[PDB]
Amino acid sequence: ASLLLHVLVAHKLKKSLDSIPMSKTIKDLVGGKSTVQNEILGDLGKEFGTTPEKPEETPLEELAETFQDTFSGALGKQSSSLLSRLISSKMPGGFTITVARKYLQTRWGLPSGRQDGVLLVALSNEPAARLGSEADAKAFLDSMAQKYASIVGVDLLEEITKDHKVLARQQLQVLARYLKMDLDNGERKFLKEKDTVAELQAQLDYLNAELGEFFVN
Amino acid sequence: DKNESATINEMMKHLGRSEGNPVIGVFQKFLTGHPKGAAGAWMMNGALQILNSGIIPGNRNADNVDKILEQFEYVLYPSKTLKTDGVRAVSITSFGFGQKGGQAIVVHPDYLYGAITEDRYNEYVAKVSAREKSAYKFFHNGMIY
Amino acid sequence: GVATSFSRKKARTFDSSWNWAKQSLLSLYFEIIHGVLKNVDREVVSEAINIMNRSNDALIKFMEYHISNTDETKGENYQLVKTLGEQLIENCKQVLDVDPVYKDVAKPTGPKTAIDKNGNITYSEEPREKVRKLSQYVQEMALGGPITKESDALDKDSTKEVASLPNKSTISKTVSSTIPRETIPFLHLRKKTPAGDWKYDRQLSSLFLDGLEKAAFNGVTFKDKYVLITGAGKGSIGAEVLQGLLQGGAKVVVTTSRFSKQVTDYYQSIYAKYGAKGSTLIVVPFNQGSKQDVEALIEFIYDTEKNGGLGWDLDAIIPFAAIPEQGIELEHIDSKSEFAHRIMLTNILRMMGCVKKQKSARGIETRPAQVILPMSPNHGTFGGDGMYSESKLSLETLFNRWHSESWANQLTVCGAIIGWTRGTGLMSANNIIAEGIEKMGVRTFSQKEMAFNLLGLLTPEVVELCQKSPVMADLNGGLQFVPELKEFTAKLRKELVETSEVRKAVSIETALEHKVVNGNSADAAYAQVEIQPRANIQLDFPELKPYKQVKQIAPAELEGLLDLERVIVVTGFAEVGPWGSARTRWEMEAFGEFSLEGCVEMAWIMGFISYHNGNLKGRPYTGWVDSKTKEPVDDKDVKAKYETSILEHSGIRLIEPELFNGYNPEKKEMIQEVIVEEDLEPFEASKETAEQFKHQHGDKVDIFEIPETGEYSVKLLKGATLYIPKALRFDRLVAGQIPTGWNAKTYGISDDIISQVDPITLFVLVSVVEAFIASGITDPYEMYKYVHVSEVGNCSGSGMGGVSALRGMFKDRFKDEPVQNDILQESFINTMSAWVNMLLISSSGPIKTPVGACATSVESVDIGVETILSGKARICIVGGYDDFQEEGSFEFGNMKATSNTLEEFEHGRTPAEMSRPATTTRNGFMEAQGAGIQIIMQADLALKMGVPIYGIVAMAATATDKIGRSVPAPGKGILTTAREHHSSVKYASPNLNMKYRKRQL
Amino acid sequence: EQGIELEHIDSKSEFAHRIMLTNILRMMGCVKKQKSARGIETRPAQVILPMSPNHGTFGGDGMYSESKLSLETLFNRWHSESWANQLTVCGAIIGW
Amino acid sequence: GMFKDRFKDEPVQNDILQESFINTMSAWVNMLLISSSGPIKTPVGACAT
Amino acid sequence: PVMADLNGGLQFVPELKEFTAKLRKELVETSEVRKAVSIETALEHKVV
Amino acid sequence: KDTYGFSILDIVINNPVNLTIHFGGEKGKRIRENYSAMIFETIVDGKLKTEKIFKEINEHSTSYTFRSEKG
Ligand SMILES: NC(=O)C1=CN([C@@H]2O[C@H](COP(=O)(O)OP(=O)(O)OC[C@H]3O[C@@H](n4cnc5c(N)ncnc54)[C@H](OP(=O)(O)O)[C@@H]3O)[C@@H](O)[C@H]2O)C=CC1
């Protein structure tokens, strides 16, 4: 909770993760600009839910103390939006956050909960413009996995058929386009049907809650 | 809301009202909404209707006036139309972005016609009356065609 | 019907009683001056007591200034206000630091069914003969009558009656001894005999009636009483019990089922009239036939303010709510009666069953809650009740179960047996037989009387008596002593039904004989000719008083003292807002409804009706004609045809997309940059455009020429950037808009200009033209017969002003839409004042343009008065205007300036309820549209022109606040207009005296 | 229903209000629509309602007391509604 | 920032409308400097301002 | 209508609830106090 | 609890600002006459005068409040 709070404050102030000490408070960081102060509360009321009684005055070393009791190992709501918009504007084409998790695990040896923190260190040090090359993305991610290790303290043949199975997968679409057959009509009828199942459960479990399970059964 | 009530109470208190003469606070943005260019003019057309008629209209959404606003004993907050026998002067206070505040005050027109003389007033009355009839004819014709 | 309606954010508490007594007293002030209310009225006595219930130290100082300032010489009503007023200043100083009091004043009425000779039935509530009080209603209820045989200064002087209000009545002739021996009263409490039945007890009922007498003389107090009451709709007992709870200081939850704006403006009007000092009022929406709302409301009452609840307790619970069942018999007992068994019985048991689990948790066993069950005397005795009888009978079992179960400490039952209350939704269907049922000796009660009889069950004599044993109040006028109540019911009806027909069909025949013996045309000259009104829309210039009457207002030394060249004067004014012009806005503002001359202007504004001259279907016509169907509409019928649609589409409402160029608030278009991952399909393009794609994308895009057609073929390769549209559901859904159909074409603006100019200038040209119409200027060149050309200013700017022509330049060039080539011209703030000088006025005065960004128009008056007093202008336009568009609305939303709209639906607010200044739960403003100008002028030249002088702008100022880092934060910079020095306040300055300034002059 | 008091009145007592009261009314309400169709008005059906003497007097009956009390209203409604020819009520008050 | 950089959905400030007015360049002269309460009448002339 | 009241006089006892629990608590306690006394004199009898 | 209508544990655990005793049914009435028995004698020069500690608790009082700023 200290690792997530330090990033989301440093984003809203648009400063580095070292230029803000956590011994200070939210009020002494802004300057007086009360538009920013409501933005700091709203990003943290969404992310953790449990908001303390004096957030704006208490130092940030004491607020990660409070947030730790009700936060463990999640991504969240506010944090998952800032890290997908990070890839959708600063990372190259075909390089999604799925590729940004395959790279941190295979080369650097980082499981799922660790590399959720590597992306948070990469959020406050985001590039000024889009990375152009495919390897310059990997040079960016190698550079941030060691700036994450300075916070935590941890030292660190099938491609011959993927370019083949691309060809069979792209040949399959052009035959299906030729036959004018819809390969997704199964799923669209499926996905618009779990809506009506869950809607009936919303209606049906309303009546076992109103009338009771003894009455209805 | 807190600032406007506070400013009005402070000026009235400093100048020496009587205790027990609160200014009645009309609100117009309940019905039209707040424009930002047109804001002070809609308050300015409203004042010259409250002056001539003597009707004090009412904020018809003030379901509950705020509890903080009781410490301003020199204001009042109505919620219904209150037709009086004479409004002598109306205040018009507009606060803007960029710390642009400002007030006006609008006296009744019958205080102009005390500095006038009876030759002048009678002569003026006839001219205005002729203009009033003529203007009326013009407005109806244009409206219709 | 079982579907839930309660929520925690849909409560409305009412707590500003410290201001509805300064309002209600000043509302009584002018209704005595102008002659609305006179000395006879008992409502002024009723309005006296609702101010004596709310007496603070600040309120008498309000009253003392308004009575000491009125001048008795001018009128006879001016003497009247000071007589009542000093009598009520007398009374409030004694009831100060005294708990408030419920005392119903008004005349107790009776029934009257009168049948006209034409055969029409009419029920009229008539003031009774010998019962003119509630102190006389008490002595009637203690006498009984004939059938129970087994064992003031008011209408003649308000000011004397107003004097008798603080004084408590001192008696000794006890009304317990006024009861005749071997005669049951009409209002008797009961007692369970050890045989097991409930029989009439003398001493229990005598303790009820004696305290009920003191409730009429002195009155009840309910301070610190916490009450639940459901089923409190308009025109029922629960609304008249509510008025007696709020008047005495109770703290009351009231739950409504049809939650609206109409309902919440009614519950505001109740608290703005009756709610005493310290009382409070909550309206929550509700369902009582829902199990999950009786659970969720009793939680929300006892739960603490830290978690959103009330933190209250409860000392009375009154579950009155019922639905109508009629025509429903035992074979037609169905789901409607089965939904209503649950409202009236087996969710009343879950209100009494769930307040005990709220007192079990909190350990509260020394504060009972008196339950007040409404019972009935007729269990099966009427016809098809449905299951009304079954529900009522079940409630009677509770009296025994208080002795036998474990909830005797948290709840105490107090069953009331309410008699004939007529008017309420159960027993209002038969008022025509109520007069005949009283012929026996049975008594019927109006609603303020069974308000009075149920509020005698909360007095501290009977509140203590409930806490020993259960209390059964039988409040029938002897309606259990009539044999065959059903047979006598249909007997009285079938007489009054037949007499209503047999006197009708006989009178219809002797009028058919009369037109046969004497014919039709002999009596055709005996009918009359009526007249329907036409609409005569006036300009409403100020009514001028004679010169004798005028100088009685102004001081006498002002004549010749005061230079009229340097007095500024508003000569005209006009505007365009969400309610049309300045005339149809005042009818909605002052009155809340349109006139006949306002339904005609609001239909001519929005283009509904439309003047036709010539021939309609051969015959000539001149009048208003629907512009849709070209078929005639009379001014008597402009209302009922169009009052619905004008109130639908005018004012603050949902944002309508046709007005704002396809802008849907729910679907706000945005483009996101993607990268292509493989190459796209070749699309064919022209020569110049495909050379533009190549200079952009460089080595990524691929252009090749097609040999026959001569137009190129463009292929994208892997690594190019696309912009795919997405759409964002946006929150801000509501804005106050110029009414739907406001065309600038209907005022006379050509298509040469509308197609060329910005929409905000169409708001201005209509507001400048109409402002000379209010000024008597019919030709704008009449200003030059008196003034020079280079002495007519135009000082009138906007806040943003041209938002529609900034997205022509930042957003519609980038999209490469067909845009004008001179959009930058039409986007400035000083170009809406160019078309006022290009299409109108042709003057050469100052054109100093203001910008204030929300205060553009008071600044504009300031620049105006400063311009005229130096003689640079002798006339100048002043005003301000602004346009509403998509992008400005989104950007006020990110600043948290305008209010969210989906938060407001969650509170149950309606669009005509979301702009609320000075409110406890205000949340932001409501961004609107339109213009408004004024034409100011010297006061010297306004007399020489002959123009309507509407005002005197004595002052105009602007002021800047202080150091900060926040621009939208307001400040007190304009507090420096009251700046004067108070070092020497000893002796009067001669300079402020006016006779001194006259002598110097 | 036993051990069930006013704060523990729940769906078990609400299922049983319907057995003992407001479906007894639909037996007496549906034999009359079978004699309405067939025109039978010279052959009544004596209804035998089981009543109780103890309406609230025991401890936690649940809603047993409420159901029983409601049945007593039928005696009056035989005089006042339109089903006096098809049904005749005969309320028994069974003791211990 | 408001007509073109929201539509592109770039990262923009949340108070750009504040900083776009013509009477807000004279706000930072009273917020960072002079702390006075005199008139703040703002002109627009579009070439003759 | 016919109302048959078939109680043996069970509407003539005052406080039917109070007299109900009075008869039970005597017969419950006598069922215990005659039980736990007899279980001890058999535990004494196997000690002496 | 049984004589004065407050629990001393709740006073120590979460320190209240005000505490209104309520005087409800039989238990409440029983509690109130325990407040009405607060008279102290001093055998005045051969007399006996009792002054009630709680002033306003009479036979009509439905409550009484203990007040404090902090706790
Ligand atoms: N009036 C009489 O003659 C007598 C009446 N009684 C009883 O006294 C009470 C008097 O009511 P009265 O005011 O006369 O009748 P009304 O029908 O006027 O009032 C009952 C209120 O219940 C509310 N309500 C209706 N349906 C529901 C629901 N499903 N859920 C929640 N609330 C609902 C209604 O107003 P809204 O939804 O707006 O709140 C309604 O006004 C009734 O219970 C009646 O049985 C007893 C003896 C005599």
Side-chain angles (χ1 to χ4, degrees), chain B residues 1 29 42 45 81 103 131 138, chain C residues 575 590 782 915 922 934 977:
Chain B
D1 295 321
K29 310 292 180 65
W42 292 358
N45 302 328
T81 297
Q103 70 166 342
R131 286 275 264 259
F138 174 109
Chain C
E575 70 191 5
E782 186 176 356
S915 181
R922 63 188 186 274
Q934 289 87 25
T977 66

mmCIF file with all atom_site columns, all heavy atoms in Angstrom, chain B residues 1 29 42 45 81 103 131 138, chain C residues 575 590 782 915 922 934 977:
data_model
loop_
_atom_site.group_PDB
_atom_site.id
_atom_site.type_symbol
_atom_site.label_atom_id
_atom_site.label_alt_id
_atom_site.label_comp_id
_atom_site.label_asym_id
_atom_site.label_entity_id
_atom_site.label_seq_id
_atom_site.pdbx_PDB_ins_code
_atom_site.Cartn_x
_atom_site.Cartn_y
_atom_site.Cartn_z
_atom_site.occupancy
_atom_site.B_iso_or_equiv
_atom_site.pdbx_formal_charge
_atom_site.auth_seq_id
_atom_site.auth_comp_id
_atom_site.auth_asym_id
_atom_site.auth_atom_id
_atom_site.pdbx_PDB_model_num
ATOM 1   N N   . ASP B 1 1   ? -22.531 30.448 -2.395  1.00 0.00 ? 1   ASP B N   1
ATOM 2   C CA  . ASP B 1 1   ? -23.642 30.805 -1.521  1.00 0.00 ? 1   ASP B CA  1
ATOM 3   C C   . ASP B 1 1   ? -23.216 31.349 -0.164  1.00 0.00 ? 1   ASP B C   1
ATOM 4   O O   . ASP B 1 1   ? -23.801 32.307 0.332   1.00 0.00 ? 1   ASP B O   1
ATOM 5   C CB  . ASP B 1 1   ? -24.580 29.612 -1.348  1.00 0.00 ? 1   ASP B CB  1
ATOM 6   C CG  . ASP B 1 1   ? -25.265 29.223 -2.642  1.00 0.00 ? 1   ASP B CG  1
ATOM 7   O OD1 . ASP B 1 1   ? -25.641 30.129 -3.413  1.00 0.00 ? 1   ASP B OD1 1
ATOM 8   O OD2 . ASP B 1 1   ? -25.433 28.010 -2.884  1.00 0.00 ? 1   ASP B OD2 1
ATOM 9   N N   . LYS B 1 29  ? -31.797 32.288 -10.599 1.00 0.00 ? 29  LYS B N   1
ATOM 10  C CA  . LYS B 1 29  ? -31.147 31.202 -11.296 1.00 0.00 ? 29  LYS B CA  1
ATOM 11  C C   . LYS B 1 29  ? -31.790 29.862 -10.992 1.00 0.00 ? 29  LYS B C   1
ATOM 12  O O   . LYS B 1 29  ? -31.360 28.857 -11.558 1.00 0.00 ? 29  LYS B O   1
ATOM 13  C CB  . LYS B 1 29  ? -29.671 31.172 -10.923 1.00 0.00 ? 29  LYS B CB  1
ATOM 14  C CG  . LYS B 1 29  ? -28.975 32.511 -11.049 1.00 0.00 ? 29  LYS B CG  1
ATOM 15  C CD  . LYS B 1 29  ? -28.844 32.997 -12.468 1.00 0.00 ? 29  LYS B CD  1
ATOM 16  C CE  . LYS B 1 29  ? -28.149 34.332 -12.493 1.00 0.00 ? 29  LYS B CE  1
ATOM 17  N NZ  . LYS B 1 29  ? -26.769 34.197 -12.006 1.00 0.00 ? 29  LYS B NZ  1
ATOM 18  N N   . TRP B 1 42  ? -29.786 39.398 -16.764 1.00 0.00 ? 42  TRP B N   1
ATOM 19  C CA  . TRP B 1 42  ? -31.043 38.785 -16.343 1.00 0.00 ? 42  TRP B CA  1
ATOM 20  C C   . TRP B 1 42  ? -31.404 39.208 -14.928 1.00 0.00 ? 42  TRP B C   1
ATOM 21  O O   . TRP B 1 42  ? -32.581 39.310 -14.579 1.00 0.00 ? 42  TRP B O   1
ATOM 22  C CB  . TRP B 1 42  ? -30.954 37.262 -16.422 1.00 0.00 ? 42  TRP B CB  1
ATOM 23  C CG  . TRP B 1 42  ? -30.845 36.684 -17.789 1.00 0.00 ? 42  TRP B CG  1
ATOM 24  C CD1 . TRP B 1 42  ? -30.849 37.347 -18.965 1.00 0.00 ? 42  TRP B CD1 1
ATOM 25  C CD2 . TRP B 1 42  ? -30.748 35.303 -18.111 1.00 0.00 ? 42  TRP B CD2 1
ATOM 26  N NE1 . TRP B 1 42  ? -30.740 36.468 -20.005 1.00 0.00 ? 42  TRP B NE1 1
ATOM 27  C CE2 . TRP B 1 42  ? -30.679 35.201 -19.499 1.00 0.00 ? 42  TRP B CE2 1
ATOM 28  C CE3 . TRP B 1 42  ? -30.699 34.142 -17.355 1.00 0.00 ? 42  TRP B CE3 1
ATOM 29  C CZ2 . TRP B 1 42  ? -30.568 33.993 -20.143 1.00 0.00 ? 42  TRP B CZ2 1
ATOM 30  C CZ3 . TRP B 1 42  ? -30.594 32.956 -17.999 1.00 0.00 ? 42  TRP B CZ3 1
ATOM 31  C CH2 . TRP B 1 42  ? -30.517 32.884 -19.373 1.00 0.00 ? 42  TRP B CH2 1
ATOM 32  N N   . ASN B 1 45  ? -32.717 42.902 -15.605 1.00 0.00 ? 45  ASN B N   1
ATOM 33  C CA  . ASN B 1 45  ? -34.091 43.019 -16.077 1.00 0.00 ? 45  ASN B CA  1
ATOM 34  C C   . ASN B 1 45  ? -35.052 42.680 -14.959 1.00 0.00 ? 45  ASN B C   1
ATOM 35  O O   . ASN B 1 45  ? -36.153 43.225 -14.887 1.00 0.00 ? 45  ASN B O   1
ATOM 36  C CB  . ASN B 1 45  ? -34.342 42.082 -17.255 1.00 0.00 ? 45  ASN B CB  1
ATOM 37  C CG  . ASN B 1 45  ? -33.421 42.330 -18.413 1.00 0.00 ? 45  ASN B CG  1
ATOM 38  O OD1 . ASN B 1 45  ? -33.004 43.448 -18.661 1.00 0.00 ? 45  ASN B OD1 1
ATOM 39  N ND2 . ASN B 1 45  ? -33.128 41.287 -19.156 1.00 0.00 ? 45  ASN B ND2 1
ATOM 40  N N   . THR B 1 81  ? -43.835 34.154 -3.796  1.00 0.00 ? 81  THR B N   1
ATOM 41  C CA  . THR B 1 81  ? -44.022 35.478 -4.364  1.00 0.00 ? 81  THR B CA  1
ATOM 42  C C   . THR B 1 81  ? -44.637 36.423 -3.355  1.00 0.00 ? 81  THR B C   1
ATOM 43  O O   . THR B 1 81  ? -45.657 36.110 -2.744  1.00 0.00 ? 81  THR B O   1
ATOM 44  C CB  . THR B 1 81  ? -44.923 35.354 -5.572  1.00 0.00 ? 81  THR B CB  1
ATOM 45  O OG1 . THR B 1 81  ? -44.277 34.542 -6.556  1.00 0.00 ? 81  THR B OG1 1
ATOM 46  C CG2 . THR B 1 81  ? -45.252 36.698 -6.147  1.00 0.00 ? 81  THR B CG2 1
ATOM 47  N N   . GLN B 1 103 ? -21.196 44.788 -7.664  1.00 0.00 ? 103 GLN B N   1
ATOM 48  C CA  . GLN B 1 103 ? -22.579 45.057 -7.320  1.00 0.00 ? 103 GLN B CA  1
ATOM 49  C C   . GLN B 1 103 ? -23.074 46.340 -7.960  1.00 0.00 ? 103 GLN B C   1
ATOM 50  O O   . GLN B 1 103 ? -22.285 47.224 -8.291  1.00 0.00 ? 103 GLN B O   1
ATOM 51  C CB  . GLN B 1 103 ? -22.819 45.155 -5.818  1.00 0.00 ? 103 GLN B CB  1
ATOM 52  C CG  . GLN B 1 103 ? -22.244 46.347 -5.164  1.00 0.00 ? 103 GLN B CG  1
ATOM 53  C CD  . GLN B 1 103 ? -22.799 46.532 -3.789  1.00 0.00 ? 103 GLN B CD  1
ATOM 54  O OE1 . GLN B 1 103 ? -23.834 45.976 -3.449  1.00 0.00 ? 103 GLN B OE1 1
ATOM 55  N NE2 . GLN B 1 103 ? -22.070 47.253 -2.960  1.00 0.00 ? 103 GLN B NE2 1
ATOM 56  N N   . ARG B 1 131 ? -45.515 58.225 -27.151 1.00 0.00 ? 131 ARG B N   1
ATOM 57  C CA  . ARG B 1 131 ? -44.529 57.222 -27.524 1.00 0.00 ? 131 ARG B CA  1
ATOM 58  C C   . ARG B 1 131 ? -45.013 55.835 -27.159 1.00 0.00 ? 131 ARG B C   1
ATOM 59  O O   . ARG B 1 131 ? -44.816 54.886 -27.909 1.00 0.00 ? 131 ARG B O   1
ATOM 60  C CB  . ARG B 1 131 ? -43.199 57.494 -26.826 1.00 0.00 ? 131 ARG B CB  1
ATOM 61  C CG  . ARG B 1 131 ? -42.433 58.674 -27.396 1.00 0.00 ? 131 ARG B CG  1
ATOM 62  C CD  . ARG B 1 131 ? -41.593 58.265 -28.590 1.00 0.00 ? 131 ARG B CD  1
ATOM 63  N NE  . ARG B 1 131 ? -40.215 57.988 -28.211 1.00 0.00 ? 131 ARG B NE  1
ATOM 64  C CZ  . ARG B 1 131 ? -39.214 58.839 -28.395 1.00 0.00 ? 131 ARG B CZ  1
ATOM 65  N NH1 . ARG B 1 131 ? -39.439 60.015 -28.956 1.00 0.00 ? 131 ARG B NH1 1
ATOM 66  N NH2 . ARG B 1 131 ? -37.987 58.512 -28.022 1.00 0.00 ? 131 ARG B NH2 1
ATOM 67  N N   . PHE B 1 138 ? -46.445 49.517 -33.193 1.00 0.00 ? 138 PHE B N   1
ATOM 68  C CA  . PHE B 1 138 ? -45.300 48.976 -33.910 1.00 0.00 ? 138 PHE B CA  1
ATOM 69  C C   . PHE B 1 138 ? -44.962 47.547 -33.514 1.00 0.00 ? 138 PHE B C   1
ATOM 70  O O   . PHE B 1 138 ? -44.681 46.713 -34.365 1.00 0.00 ? 138 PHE B O   1
ATOM 71  C CB  . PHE B 1 138 ? -44.085 49.871 -33.675 1.00 0.00 ? 138 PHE B CB  1
ATOM 72  C CG  . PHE B 1 138 ? -42.813 49.333 -34.256 1.00 0.00 ? 138 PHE B CG  1
ATOM 73  C CD1 . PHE B 1 138 ? -42.234 49.934 -35.356 1.00 0.00 ? 138 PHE B CD1 1
ATOM 74  C CD2 . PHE B 1 138 ? -42.195 48.230 -33.699 1.00 0.00 ? 138 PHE B CD2 1
ATOM 75  C CE1 . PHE B 1 138 ? -41.063 49.443 -35.893 1.00 0.00 ? 138 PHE B CE1 1
ATOM 76  C CE2 . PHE B 1 138 ? -41.025 47.733 -34.230 1.00 0.00 ? 138 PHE B CE2 1
ATOM 77  C CZ  . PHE B 1 138 ? -40.457 48.341 -35.330 1.00 0.00 ? 138 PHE B CZ  1
ATOM 78  N N   . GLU C 2 575 ? -34.306 40.525 -23.487 1.00 0.00 ? 575 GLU C N   1
ATOM 79  C CA  . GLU C 2 575 ? -33.508 39.339 -23.234 1.00 0.00 ? 575 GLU C CA  1
ATOM 80  C C   . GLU C 2 575 ? -34.116 38.162 -23.965 1.00 0.00 ? 575 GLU C C   1
ATOM 81  O O   . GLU C 2 575 ? -35.215 38.243 -24.506 1.00 0.00 ? 575 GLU C O   1
ATOM 82  C CB  . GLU C 2 575 ? -33.421 39.022 -21.745 1.00 0.00 ? 575 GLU C CB  1
ATOM 83  C CG  . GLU C 2 575 ? -34.693 38.547 -21.147 1.00 0.00 ? 575 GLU C CG  1
ATOM 84  C CD  . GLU C 2 575 ? -34.608 38.504 -19.661 1.00 0.00 ? 575 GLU C CD  1
ATOM 85  O OE1 . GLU C 2 575 ? -33.573 38.933 -19.125 1.00 0.00 ? 575 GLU C OE1 1
ATOM 86  O OE2 . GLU C 2 575 ? -35.566 38.057 -19.013 1.00 0.00 ? 575 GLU C OE2 1
ATOM 87  N N   . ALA C 2 590 ? -42.571 35.209 -11.244 1.00 0.00 ? 590 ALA C N   1
ATOM 88  C CA  . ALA C 2 590 ? -43.409 35.765 -10.197 1.00 0.00 ? 590 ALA C CA  1
ATOM 89  C C   . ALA C 2 590 ? -44.574 34.854 -9.895  1.00 0.00 ? 590 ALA C C   1
ATOM 90  O O   . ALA C 2 590 ? -44.948 34.682 -8.736  1.00 0.00 ? 590 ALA C O   1
ATOM 91  C CB  . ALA C 2 590 ? -43.920 37.137 -10.600 1.00 0.00 ? 590 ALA C CB  1
ATOM 92  N N   . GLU C 2 782 ? -34.136 57.438 -34.692 1.00 0.00 ? 782 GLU C N   1
ATOM 93  C CA  . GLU C 2 782 ? -34.711 58.488 -33.860 1.00 0.00 ? 782 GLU C CA  1
ATOM 94  C C   . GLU C 2 782 ? -33.747 58.940 -32.769 1.00 0.00 ? 782 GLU C C   1
ATOM 95  O O   . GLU C 2 782 ? -33.879 60.047 -32.238 1.00 0.00 ? 782 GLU C O   1
ATOM 96  C CB  . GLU C 2 782 ? -36.027 58.000 -33.244 1.00 0.00 ? 782 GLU C CB  1
ATOM 97  C CG  . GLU C 2 782 ? -36.814 59.028 -32.475 1.00 0.00 ? 782 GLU C CG  1
ATOM 98  C CD  . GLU C 2 782 ? -38.125 58.519 -31.977 1.00 0.00 ? 782 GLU C CD  1
ATOM 99  O OE1 . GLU C 2 782 ? -38.473 57.365 -32.291 1.00 0.00 ? 782 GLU C OE1 1
ATOM 100 O OE2 . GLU C 2 782 ? -38.803 59.274 -31.256 1.00 0.00 ? 782 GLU C OE2 1
ATOM 101 N N   . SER C 2 915 ? -31.475 23.424 -9.971  1.00 0.00 ? 915 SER C N   1
ATOM 102 C CA  . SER C 2 915 ? -30.837 24.713 -9.731  1.00 0.00 ? 915 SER C CA  1
ATOM 103 C C   . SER C 2 915 ? -31.445 25.262 -8.449  1.00 0.00 ? 915 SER C C   1
ATOM 104 O O   . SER C 2 915 ? -32.607 25.658 -8.423  1.00 0.00 ? 915 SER C O   1
ATOM 105 C CB  . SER C 2 915 ? -31.039 25.640 -10.921 1.00 0.00 ? 915 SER C CB  1
ATOM 106 O OG  . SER C 2 915 ? -30.402 26.887 -10.717 1.00 0.00 ? 915 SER C OG  1
ATOM 107 N N   . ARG C 2 922 ? -27.335 21.886 -1.956  1.00 0.00 ? 922 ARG C N   1
ATOM 108 C CA  . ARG C 2 922 ? -26.945 22.305 -3.292  1.00 0.00 ? 922 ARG C CA  1
ATOM 109 C C   . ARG C 2 922 ? -25.613 21.682 -3.661  1.00 0.00 ? 922 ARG C C   1
ATOM 110 O O   . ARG C 2 922 ? -24.824 21.311 -2.794  1.00 0.00 ? 922 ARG C O   1
ATOM 111 C CB  . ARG C 2 922 ? -26.853 23.814 -3.355  1.00 0.00 ? 922 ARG C CB  1
ATOM 112 C CG  . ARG C 2 922 ? -25.820 24.367 -2.451  1.00 0.00 ? 922 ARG C CG  1
ATOM 113 C CD  . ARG C 2 922 ? -25.922 25.846 -2.424  1.00 0.00 ? 922 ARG C CD  1
ATOM 114 N NE  . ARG C 2 922 ? -24.845 26.466 -1.674  1.00 0.00 ? 922 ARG C NE  1
ATOM 115 C CZ  . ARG C 2 922 ? -24.858 26.651 -0.364  1.00 0.00 ? 922 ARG C CZ  1
ATOM 116 N NH1 . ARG C 2 922 ? -25.894 26.262 0.359   1.00 0.00 ? 922 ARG C NH1 1
ATOM 117 N NH2 . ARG C 2 922 ? -23.826 27.227 0.223   1.00 0.00 ? 922 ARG C NH2 1
ATOM 118 N N   . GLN C 2 934 ? -29.475 46.144 -21.983 1.00 0.00 ? 934 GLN C N   1
ATOM 119 C CA  . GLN C 2 934 ? -30.160 47.365 -21.578 1.00 0.00 ? 934 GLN C CA  1
ATOM 120 C C   . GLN C 2 934 ? -29.593 48.543 -22.348 1.00 0.00 ? 934 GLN C C   1
ATOM 121 O O   . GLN C 2 934 ? -28.438 48.549 -22.756 1.00 0.00 ? 934 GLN C O   1
ATOM 122 C CB  . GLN C 2 934 ? -30.035 47.677 -20.080 1.00 0.00 ? 934 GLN C CB  1
ATOM 123 C CG  . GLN C 2 934 ? -30.805 46.778 -19.200 1.00 0.00 ? 934 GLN C CG  1
ATOM 124 C CD  . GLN C 2 934 ? -30.024 45.579 -18.847 1.00 0.00 ? 934 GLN C CD  1
ATOM 125 O OE1 . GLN C 2 934 ? -28.802 45.600 -18.854 1.00 0.00 ? 934 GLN C OE1 1
ATOM 126 N NE2 . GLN C 2 934 ? -30.715 44.495 -18.574 1.00 0.00 ? 934 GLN C NE2 1
ATOM 127 N N   . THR C 2 977 ? -17.291 48.494 -1.011  1.00 0.00 ? 977 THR C N   1
ATOM 128 C CA  . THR C 2 977 ? -18.176 49.563 -1.446  1.00 0.00 ? 977 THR C CA  1
ATOM 129 C C   . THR C 2 977 ? -18.892 50.168 -0.259  1.00 0.00 ? 977 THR C C   1
ATOM 130 O O   . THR C 2 977 ? -19.551 51.199 -0.378  1.00 0.00 ? 977 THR C O   1
ATOM 131 C CB  . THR C 2 977 ? -19.178 49.035 -2.446  1.00 0.00 ? 977 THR C CB  1
ATOM 132 O OG1 . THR C 2 977 ? -20.044 48.100 -1.805  1.00 0.00 ? 977 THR C OG1 1
ATOM 133 C CG2 . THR C 2 977 ? -18.457 48.332 -3.529  1.00 0.00 ? 977 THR C CG2 1
#
